[PDB]
Design a protein around this ligand. Structure first.
Ligand SMILES: C[S@@+](CC[C@H](N)C(=O)[O-])C[C@H]1O[C@@H](n2cnc3c(N)ncnc32)[C@H](O)[C@@H]1O
Ligand code: SF4
Ligand code: SF4
Ligand code: SF4
Ligand SMILES: [Cl-]
Ligand SMILES: [Cl-]
Lengths: 369, 10
């Protein structure tokens, strides 16, 4: 009201085996629970509840897992439900985050005609991408992802690139930025690679350490700002979010406002969680078939989840960048179960990045008003 | 706001 949901229509099921992914079962030692494909009755109950209860507008985002594994027919059905049951004539936004490997002519057409905003996961040029994003047999995926982008350009699907920043990304910002430029990808989101929740940090070859992230951010900013000066505008979600915070005092990105929200993550059995990073039994709010969205929001579990994020670290209280950074995403402060949050893992990276980039960030903000 | 690992604009 408005309502935004993050739906996993094929649960944690996926066809790849990306090395850093903790959203899909990779092996005997990294298992993730799967509820299978969302049944029609759950999808129907979910869609009608959102249309009945939202005010203003609503948004349905499909992730996972690989959501195309639910099949095109599932999304056909989704659209049919939205047409028939939107009694309030709400504006509806749909979005899909995909590995792109199963995208074909049919998918591209459908996503284009139905105005989906699509996020396509691509870590950079061939070798960088393939290093971590492998298929079930350990083989390469980059060419199949390029094929999806090609189909999206052909059918005029609106899409953003989702790129995970690993230690390797930090060593090759030039290759990554230039690759995306050459492909004319104008909307980029760079996601810090997370180690698995509550594991000791920085133990994997891909692990993004704070010194790596500092190197990544400073260099990325330079390429971006050079483009800005030359009149080539590239949207980088993190920088866009800093600009919003500078001009408006708030950001449209979760994790940049200093406190958590309820993202209404819906697993394929209809179970609901407050954040994509926290699809765990201890944060299971209830089932969307049997509770109103307000009831889910008002649960003690959701209240607790959000309130834990209100704690401000002492360093943050005296930090010059507090009103810009706000302590960052709670997931990067959450070091051990049931313990109080601590200082953001990337605190040092933010400080050093701000010292490097703030003067130019202000220049951009002044120019976009 | 919008989730971290999801497509978003502006
Ligand atoms: C979990 S995937 C689900 C949708 C789809 N399978 C895909 O890859 O785009 C959503 C996004 O999360 C990213 N992701 C996976 N593991 C991550 C990690 N350890 N840290 C940060 N982002 C990660 C993926 O690369 C992808 O961009
Ligand atoms: S394709 Fe997406 S869900 Fe599947 S393993 Fe890779 S990042 Fe995880
Ligand atoms: S953990 Fe981060 S992404 Fe999740 S709700 Fe909190 S701020 Fe948002
Ligand atoms: S830079 Fe560090 S100390 Fe400053 S607000 Fe961010 S997390 Fe807190
Ligand atoms: Cl390849
Ligand atoms: Cl970004």
């Amino acid at each position: 009201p408005p309502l935004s949901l993050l739906i996993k229509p094929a649960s944690s099921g996926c066809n790849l085996k990306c090395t850093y992914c903790f959203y899909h079962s990779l092996s005997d030692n990294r298992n993730v629970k799967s509820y299978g494909i969302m049944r029609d009755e759950v999808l129907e109950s979910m869609v009608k509840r959102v249309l009945n209860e939202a005010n203003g507008h609503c948004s349905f985002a499909f992730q996972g897992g690989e959501p195309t594994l639910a099949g095109l027919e599932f999304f056909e059905k989704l659209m049919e439900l939205q047409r028939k049951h939107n009694y309030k004539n709400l504006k509806i936004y749909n979005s899909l985050q995909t590995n792109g490997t199963l995208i074909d002519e049919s998918w591209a057409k459908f996503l284009s005609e139905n105005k989906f905003l699509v996020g396509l996961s691509m870590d950079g040029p061939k070798e960088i991408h393939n290093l971590n994003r492998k298929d079930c047999c350990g083989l390469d995926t980059f060419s199949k992802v390029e094929r999806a982008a090609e189909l999206f350009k052909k059918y005029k699907v609106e899409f953003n690139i989702l790129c995970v920043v690993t230690s390797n990304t930090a060593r090759h910002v030039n290759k990554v930025y230039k690759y995306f430029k050459e492909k004319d990808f104008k909307f980029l989101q760079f996601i810090n690679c997370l180690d698995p929740l509550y594991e000791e940090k920085g133990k994997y070859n891909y692990s993004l350490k704070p010194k790596d992230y500092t190197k990544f951010l400073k260099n990325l900013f330079d390429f971006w700002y050079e483009d800005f000066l030359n009149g080539n505008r590239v949207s980088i979600r993190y920088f866009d979010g800093l600009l919003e915070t500078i001009l408006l005092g708030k950001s449209s990105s979760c994790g940049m406002n200093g406190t958590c929200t309820c993202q209404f993550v819906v697993e394929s059995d209809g179970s609901v969680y407050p954040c994509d990073f926290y699809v765990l039994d201890k944060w299971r709010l209830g089932n969307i078939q049997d509770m109103t969205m307000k009831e889910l929001f008002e649960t003690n579990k959701n209240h607790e989840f959000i309130k834990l994020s209100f704690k401000v670290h002492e360093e943050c209280k005296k930090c010059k960048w507090f009103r810009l950074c706000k302590g960052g995403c709670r997931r990067c402060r959450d070091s051990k179960e049931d313990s109080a949050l601590e200082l953001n893992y990337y605190c040092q990276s933010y400080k050093e990045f701000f010292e490097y980039a703030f003067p130019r960030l202000i220049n951009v903000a002044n120019n976009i008003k | 706001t919008s989730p971290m690992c999801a497509p978003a604009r502006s």
